[PDB]
Design a protein around this ligand. Structure first.
Ligand SMILES: CC(=O)NC[C@H]1O[C@H](O[C@H]2O[C@H](CO)[C@@H](O)[C@H](O)[C@H]2O)[C@H](O)[C@@H](O)[C@@H]1O
Length: 434
């Protein structure tokens, strides 16, 4: 039969490949889903997809889009509205049993242009052996890092924030948690410094970035043009504190069974031998998962994202992937059917438990079988319930590029002047000038 192309980020290739294979057994010769990988950064995923769309690549069918691209891909007509499904089933499937935050990321001008498949929110990860209590706010984070430095322990605070979208996500979380916002609701005005309260929020966020940057024992990966991994920095024992997406859970066990984690020698447990499947994925039995998790809990713990204002949780920036159908497709019906199968219950369980990507199906967070294998479900769902959002605007690419260029390196942030520079660059971005 025909082939529905399914473009996903390369680091999520295998996972989605597996999901496609499952769905391929359910169509039975009618058509086949073929996964194709896109580069690692959201900007490059966007660039590849945009080149194929403006180039009228008629072989491009289904796209796994970062939540930040919806607006653009809706305004350009690149992502077909879900109401363009010839079967008329896409919208109802997308809203059914799906968390409202992801759905909000999938909409534009009161219409859905994608069906959420994965969502994302950052947690705090710590070494319970070296850190007696997980810090609840960012000043506590700085104090704990300084204490670990004074104790000769790893004092890095591992944040996946080099000079790109990760840094913008960190800033957005800090800013919204402080009561601020990059843009107005309609995305037409810059709200970083337009009122005293807004400017105060921006200044507090920049101050937190600067103080984390210059904390005793700070990571030297920020003062360089690096592609460093906070996940691997934690897994190598260089950091006892990390804020990152939940996939680092699935990584930690997996890499520990492969022998790649020094302080967690899961590879030396005979009962875990063979728990790595033939394509390199940690697929434990129930008892093997119990063994691995109970061993990991003495050196690996999770906690809510640190608050900005002590006394209430943070507003954590939402991320994830929404499934959209490209306007270039020759088979709208099969593309939307594939979208529906790719996000069904079984594949959501798989994408969360094996792929490390938070599911969007609300039912799963109320499923005890799922909860027993995904111990972070409660914190994830609560952080998704009151999540921060990045601005939804068709010029988000230029906006994020300009904001990242100003923010980095965070060692050079001067809160007041940097706030003014951020507002000016954001204005340039939204003026059709970025
Ligand atoms: C480094 C960073 O944080 N960039 C911002 C994007 O982070 C998330 O996406 C990345 O991480 C996911 C794993 O958790 C992975 O599936 C994606 O392929 C990565 O691009 C987040 O989901 C995105 O919305 C952020 O834009």
């Amino acid at each position: 039969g025909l082939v529905v192309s399914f473009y996903t980020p390369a680091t999520d290739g295998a996972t989605f490949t597996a999901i496609a294979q499952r769905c391929n057994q359910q169509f039975g010769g009618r058509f086949t889903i073929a996964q194709v990988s896109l580069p690692r950064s959201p900007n490059e995923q966007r660039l590849q997809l945009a080149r194929r769309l403006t180039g009228n690549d008629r072989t491009l069918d289904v796209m796994a889009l970062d939540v930040v691209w919806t607006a653009e891909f809706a305004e350009a007509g690149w992502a077909l509205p879900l109401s363009d499904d010839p079967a008329g089933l896409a919208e109802n499937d997308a809203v059914a049993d799906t968390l409202p935050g992801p759905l909000a990321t999938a909409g534009w001008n009161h219409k859905l242009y994608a069906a959420p498949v994965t969502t994302n929110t950052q947690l705090l990860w710590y070494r319970p052996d070296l850190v007696n209590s997980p810090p609840t706010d960012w000043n506590a984070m700085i104090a704990e890092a300084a204490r670990l430095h004074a104790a000769g322990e790893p004092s890095w605070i591992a944040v996946q924030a080099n000079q790109g979208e990760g840094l913008v996500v960190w800033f957005n979380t800090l800013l919204v948690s402080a009561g601020g916002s990059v843009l107005s609701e309609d995305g037409r005005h810059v709200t970083l410094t337009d009122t005293p309260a807004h400017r105060a929020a921006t200044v507090s966020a920049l101050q937190i970035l600067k103080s984390v940057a210059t904390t005793p024992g700070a990571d030297p990966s920020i003062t360089r043009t690096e592609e460093g991994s906070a996940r691997l920095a934690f897994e190598q024992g260089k950091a006892a504190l990390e804020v990152n997406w939940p996939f680092v859970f699935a990584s930690m066990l997996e890499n520990a069974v492969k022998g790649g984690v020094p302080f967690l020698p899961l590879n030396r447990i005979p009962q875990l031998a063979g728990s790595i499947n033939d394509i390199g994925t940690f697929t434990p039995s129930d008892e093997q998962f119990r063994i691995a998790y109970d061993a990991s809990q003495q050196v690996f713990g999770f906690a809510p994202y640190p608050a900005v204002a002590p006394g209430q949780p943070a507003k954590v920036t939402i991320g994830g992937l929404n499934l959209a159908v490209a306007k270039t497709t020759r088979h709208r019906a099969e593309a939307f059917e594939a979208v529906r199968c790719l996000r069904d219950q079984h594949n959501q369980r798989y994408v969360s438990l094996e792929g490390g990507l938070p599911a969007v199906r609300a039912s799963l967070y109320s499923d005890p079988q799922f909860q027993a294998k995904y111990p972070m479900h409660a914190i994830i769902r609560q952080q998704l319930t009151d999540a921060a959002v990045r601005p939804a605007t068709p010029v988000y690419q230029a906006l994020s590029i300009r904001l990242a260029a100003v923010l980095s390196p965070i060692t050079e942030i001067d809160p007041e002047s940097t706030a003014d520079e951020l507002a000016a660059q954001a204005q340039k971005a939204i003026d059709g000038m970025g």
